Structure 1
Amino acid sequence: ATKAVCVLKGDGPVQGIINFEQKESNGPVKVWGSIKGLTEGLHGFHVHEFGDNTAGCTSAGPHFNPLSRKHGGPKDEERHVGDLGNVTADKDGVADVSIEDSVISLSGDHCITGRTLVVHEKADDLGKGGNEESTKTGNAGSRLACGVIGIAQ
């Protein structure tokens, strides 16, 4: 299998760890881990284009969108490659992450390694919020924590 990993950190209480595994070349990718320090509710969860955190999470740019599509949710045909939806935190501030996605990859054209995974302030409206920004970012707000996705053993 191919494996990757991301340490999420930022300028506040939000921290996390997210693991990735892809059993077959170009096959589905399992994404799992835990994020703590979150306000209760939904937090947008995306791979952004660049693995640049020079000035913090802002430096990562827009969602990873190699195919020039509008923002959506992971189950949509019309989505960014980086659109992984939301993670959901309880009152404990913890979101347990367990996702399988067939659009991201750990090899090829849609490869997410070397790019930034970001957990956002607010909910991602999955492109259904009614303004143009919904179709770009899902109105998920600021970047609470992030890290560069790296190759794992």
Structure 2
Amino acid sequence: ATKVVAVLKGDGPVQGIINFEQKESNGPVKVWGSIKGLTEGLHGFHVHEFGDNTAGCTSAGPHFNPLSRKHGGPKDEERHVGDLGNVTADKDGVADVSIEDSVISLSGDHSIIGRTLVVHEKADDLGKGGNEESTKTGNAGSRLACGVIGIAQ
């Protein structure tokens, strides 16, 4: 496929639709959409390993990391395939997403199809924190909303 989508939903007011499109097999991936119900400010944003929603967002597992790297920002050489940094909400709780990433993909080892997109309660420290946790999750906190990444076209 060249186009997939994830509909984020959680126990709370956080919700949104995120689109992904990749025209070429080894080309970049455009990510866009909106999320509401968020507190003003930054929020972690990543693709998690499992597209398993049997237990809310917690069953999505850790960050998608097929290359067994350490957590990082989307622009850091060292990073999980699923690390998409942070999204920002405005005073009304809305965050407009517009990302372009070259690590995630819709085919091969880096394929995010069938995995989960998650938006966190707090900001992602991009893996620069003075603690081991920062190198695993970025200390972004709990998962407010998530959705399985499915084929849309």
Normalising to structure 2: TM-score of the pair?
0.99
Please say if residues 26 and 108 of structure 1, whose CA atoms lie closer than 8 Å, have aligned partners that are also in contact: no
Post-superposition Cα deviations, 1:81-126, rounded to whole Å, max 9, x if no partner, equal 0000000001110000000000000111100010000000100000
- Contact in 2 for aligned 1:47/1:82 (Cα 8 Å): yes
Counterparts of 1:71-150 in structure 2 under 5 Å? 71-150=71-150
C-alpha separation between the residues in 1 aligned to 2:120 and 2:140? Answer: 6
Q: Unaligned regions of 5+ residues in structure 1, if any?
A: none
**Distance (whole Å) between structure 1 residues aligned to residue 107 and residue 26 of structure 2:** 7
Provide runs of 4+ in structure 1 moved above 4 Å: none
The alpha carbon displacement at 1:53 in A equals 0.8
Residue of structure 2 in register with 1:45 after alignment? 45
Whether the 8 Å CA contact 1:66–1:81 is kept in 2: the answer is yes
- How far residue 69 of structure 1 moved from its aligned partner, in angstroms, is 0.4
Aligned-residue CA RMSD (Å) = 0.7
Shift in Å, 1:147: 0.3
Identity of aligned residues (%): 97
Per the TM alignment, residue 26 of structure 1 is displaced from its structure 2 partner at its CA by: 1.8
Report how far residue 66 of structure 1 moved: 0.4
Aligned-partner SS, 1:50: coil
1:13 Cα offset (Å):
0.3
Deviations 1:1-50 (A, max 9, x none): 70000000000000000000001012100000000000000000000000
Unpaired stretches in structure 2, ≥5 consecutive residues:
none
Number of aligned residue pairs: 153
